[PDB]
Amino acid sequence: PPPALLEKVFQYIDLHQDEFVQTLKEWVAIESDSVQPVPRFRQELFRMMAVAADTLQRLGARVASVDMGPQQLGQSLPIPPVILAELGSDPTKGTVCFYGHLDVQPADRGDGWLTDPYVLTEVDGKLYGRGATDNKGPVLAWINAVSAFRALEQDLPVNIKFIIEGMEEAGSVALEELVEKEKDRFFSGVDYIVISDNLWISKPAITYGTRGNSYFMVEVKCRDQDFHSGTFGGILHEPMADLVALLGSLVDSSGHILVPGIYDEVVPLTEEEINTYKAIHLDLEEYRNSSRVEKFLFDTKEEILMHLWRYPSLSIHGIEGAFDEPGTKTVIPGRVIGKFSIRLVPHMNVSAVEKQVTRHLEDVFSKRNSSNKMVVSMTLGLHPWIANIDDTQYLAAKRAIRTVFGTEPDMIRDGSTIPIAKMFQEIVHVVLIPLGAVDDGEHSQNEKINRWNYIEGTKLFAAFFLEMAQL
Ligand SMILES: [Zn+2]
Ligand SMILES: [Zn+2]
């Protein structure tokens, strides 16, 4: 049983759930792809921001859609407006701000989707579609919670602010300058900030730490034109041969990173820290099963979680400029770019990591005595983020979770990076409430959010409004 007429709010959410799921279906069908520099998609992104601005206004919010200007690509594209919305300015009330994004990662059905990525399809309680979990589901769950108090003419316990952007999947272009401009304007008197764009691991969760990241591009160039692999086979220093040797020099079969210096500054594992991991709830057979992975690099819960949260990791993403379509093309690529990144943990320095990776790659390349040119560039470099657990925002969330799910949340870290979390910490001086399941498949084929997570998460947000008012 819930408290109060949270009972009535909860009743409302259960009765309007099919409507909440149809709104999500409608938002998902707007192909708000920010990553493709294609006018068709950027227009759909602007329409998305407009649909959201209208939704917030209809709820009762003062809404501003802030003109963001051009995105320099030697061409350019307009950036989608940022919604800056306020619902209530009651001086007898605290104020909570919610950040979300309504742009999505590209989705091509040919990538391996069993459904049309932009048609929300429910299969065994799972709602499949691009943006279902990342991030239209949790934005709507928050909005739908507010709309329950509004429909019932129930006083919202806190004032609510919304900051919603349309460029998160493309580096939040122009957000930081707007935030900076607004630090003592829109953010003046905002008590706590909420982000809901992350997943559980098993038991619901609250997330209080994230990894950093460093994204590397390694270009090996002969000439711009490719070669016929037979007509010119046998006589070139082939860009692909150099790149494959460069990429193959980075990590070993155990996951151990081979760049010298990389472990120098990782904080030492302590007894205390080990204990924190032992207290997390994770069935390793369950985790193997939802991931459909035969075996992981490690055998125990503690090793698995630590390698995700507090050890660095290296992933090779792909190669650009070579033969990557289906079939059997006989080509020596003239210019290729390897892509890989290293997730960063305390106490690693971004600038040192950049130096170390570069030096390593130069040393490998020079030993090849190749005629090719190599350019390493670190295109992205972010430090890790940690919240203070048992902050007032963090306690409200714990209580809200207990109310809705009837159990204590585990305090978890995250292997991914939430750059926005760091940005609000640096400029405005954040609580992460995950709604997604571990197997939601964000940034992949067959992304979903579970109906239960989406609907029960709406209730979580409702309870949370009330908890924030209570300190
Ligand atoms: Zn997201
Ligand atoms: Zn994303």
From Swiss-Prot:
Its cofactor is Zn(2+). The active site is at D103, E168. The modification Phosphoserine is found at S188. Zn(2+) 2 binds at H101, D134, D197. This is Beta-Ala-His dipeptidase. It comes from Homo sapiens. The gene is CNDP1. Belongs to the peptidase M20A family. Optimum pH is 8.5. It is found in: Secreted. GO terms for cellular component: cytosol; extracellular region. Found in serum and adult nervous central system. Absent in serum from patients with homocarnosinosis. Zn(2+) 1 binds at D134, E169, H443. Glycans are attached at N289, N349. It holds the Pfam family M20_dimer. It comes from the Eukaryota. Activated by cadmium ions. Inhibited by the metal chelator 1,10-o-phenantrolin. The inhibitory concentration 50% (IC(50)) is 5 uM.
